[PDB]
Amino acid sequence: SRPPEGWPKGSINDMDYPLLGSICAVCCVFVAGSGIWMLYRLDLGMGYSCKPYKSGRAPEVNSLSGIICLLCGTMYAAKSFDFFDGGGTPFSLNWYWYLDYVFTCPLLILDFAFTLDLPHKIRYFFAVFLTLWCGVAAFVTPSAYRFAYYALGCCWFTPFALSLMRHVKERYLVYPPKCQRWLFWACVIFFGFWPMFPILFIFSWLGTGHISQQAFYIIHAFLDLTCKSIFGILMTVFRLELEEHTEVQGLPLNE
Amino acid sequence: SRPPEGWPKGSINDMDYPLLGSICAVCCVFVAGSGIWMLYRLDLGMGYSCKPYKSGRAPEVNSLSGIICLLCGTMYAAKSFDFFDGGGTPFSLNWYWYLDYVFTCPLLILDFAFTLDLPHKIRYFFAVFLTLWCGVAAFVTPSAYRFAYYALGCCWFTPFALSLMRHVKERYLVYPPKCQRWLFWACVIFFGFWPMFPILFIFSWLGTGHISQQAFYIIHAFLDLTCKSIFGILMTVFRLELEEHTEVQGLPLNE
Amino acid sequence: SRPPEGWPKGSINDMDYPLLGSICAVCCVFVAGSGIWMLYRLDLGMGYSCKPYKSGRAPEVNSLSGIICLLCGTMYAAKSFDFFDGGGTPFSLNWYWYLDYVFTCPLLILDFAFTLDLPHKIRYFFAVFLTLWCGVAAFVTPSAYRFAYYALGCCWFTPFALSLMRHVKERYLVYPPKCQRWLFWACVIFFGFWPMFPILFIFSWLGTGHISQQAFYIIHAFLDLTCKSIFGILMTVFRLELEEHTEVQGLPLNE
Ligand SMILES: *C/C=C(C)/C=C/C=C(C)/C=C/C1=C(C)CCCC1(C)C
Ligand SMILES: *C/C=C(C)/C=C/C=C(C)/C=C/C1=C(C)CCCC1(C)C
Ligand SMILES: *C/C=C(C)/C=C/C=C(C)/C=C/C1=C(C)CCCC1(C)C
């Protein structure tokens, strides 16, 4: 991909590769670290009290928050190696925008859906999956059909966002107030930050032209830290509060 | 992919791109529309009587018919954008024949297998998956090993077709006559149309040479409409008849 | 991929393609054959006595050993067609080292994990998946970041190997001595041979330079025969011994 004489001067690929490499490297360590904390604490037991799991194992699906973090962090390690190697390398996760997200965003929606017991888990998964594929297509397409792909993207996303809103709202009163606190912050992230991604696309170098490819890399690093690690920690703490109420103390869910 | 001077005149890629774009666009709307009807009716309740689901949710796997339709329709939107953009675009679902089917055909077999309660669901899934990958390989390979890939394809498909025949036949008498009617039409499609795909490959421009790449695109649009939408509607109506008998009226399956 | 004038003389791709084709072809037949035996015997019933399954079906997950074999054998058929066609063909499973393993190795770990009832099945799956992706990246990367990808690979693999060791050791005394015999050989393969793959990478033409690309193809054919077929047969016989004890004879697991 990289011209043997380096990227052209005025090229969108004429970036500060050392800085980009560095930023991915730190993001790699914090996101992966958060995942290790998540799996560790999950194994410790149920609730803050750390009541022993009857089976001696946590439920399989509780592992998704941590796994998503370890997977996102591993991709940030790859992304770093590409930047430090100057970009345009044979195995570049920095070349096809959104391809990495095809793997992590559908897992995030499942994690949220198992944690709250939302209906229509298969639908939510495919809604998210198709949305990210439209993004990928949108980014590689140089014609105006760029915006045909983007719109097709928005067609999937909008009914997904509104459906999820209604479903979370229905379950938000089932949980006790202590649980309700963590659920609030996770909703802020989901409904605050997920819309940021398509709004950013419009102002990028592929739309209006306000945001450079370099700034775009740095911004997605902050967004990935928030949408994976912090969200992950919020799901973990939400599940600890929930277990303390229902399992350690034996109380019942409003429902 | 597209030469800057357009496709050569005698080229297999010298096609009526406006017509192809148009045809994919209509197929996109009908297939996606059918899927929306499928998920809507599923949510309404069990049977024609629309008896409330006890849990308040349909079973997850009942969503596959509709999902398959929404996924196939979304790919027909992509295929349209590629044709209208003249073909050979960076994100072309019209370039690698059969790649799209790698995602939808294994889902169709699961849908049919959950609906009838066939054995060996994991086997059926991988049988179908491998068959379509052989097709993909067959299409990109320009040598005579084209027919080595095709044969390897047929090796997977033939024992799958015969195994399924036997398994459907065993379950066809379990169901009441009203159900038996819909099951018949779905079998016609599965055993009539699925064989059409490999028979078409032989007469294509990659075999004998009777069918042009353009005609081939138009024919697969009709086959996708039949194998996804109509099949989908037949599964839906079959499940409505079945639920009316077993759930609303409480009758028992012959079995 | 292949220069129209053939591969250069001193090229790593100047190989004995007839011999390579031949070797893949035999490996294809034995691995696929073993899989057919595996599914056949599974269908026969529970234990050596072949006690009828109550449901009339084997459990779905017992099919994985055979499926993995049929999938690996099918890829060896593809690999053969590529070698006989001289290499560098459009659908070459011989071009991107380790890509094929991305599909089979995570399935092997699930098969082993369902058979022994190991905890953390989702974690084990993703540990293996990410490791093989690091291999793929390592192989295509020509820079020294080759060894950054390899190390990242080893970061996933090492905690996986040690975790599995501890978990198998905990379950190895649950099973009766007759079962314990087969479990021993399967552990030899898993802990003997899986480490062979990264040790080979170091001595290859991409590391020190002791092992040629040709020898490397032949060695992986022997390793795939051992890690898929023989392992597969060991899992099958282990499950037959186990069922004879617990199901046919009704005895209890130490646990
Ligand atoms: C961890 C990364 C996350 C949560 C990413 C989410 C990304 C989106 C919600 C992206 C949405 C898009 C559209 C709605 C349409 C156009 C293309 C996208 C991918 C930017
Ligand atoms: C919705 C699309 C469907 C149901 C497609 C099915 C396609 C096949 C059954 C194709 C079969 C093939 C072979 C049996 C061998 C050669 C290659 C194929 C893919 C044409
Ligand atoms: C059937 C094939 C099997 C069991 C292959 C297993 C392969 C590995 C365990 C490979 C391991 C690697 C590393 C630990 C790091 C570097 C890259 C690999 C893929 C060679």
Author numbering:
A (entry chain A), B (entry chain A), C (entry chain A): 6 to 260
What does the paper say about this structure?
KCR channelrhodopsins (K+-selective light-gated ion channels) have received attention as potential inhibitory optogenetic tools but more broadly pose a fundamental mystery regarding how their K+ selectivity is achieved. Here, we present 2.5–2.7 Å cryo-electron microscopy structures of HcKCR1 and HcKCR2 and of a structure-guided mutant with enhanced K+ selectivity. Structural, electrophysiological, computational, spectroscopic, and biochemical analyses reveal a distinctive mechanism for K+ selectivity; rather than forming the symmetrical filter of canonical K+ channels achieving both selectivity and dehydration, instead, three extracellular-vestibule residues within each monomer form a flexible asymmetric selectivity gate, while a distinct dehydration pathway extends intracellularly.
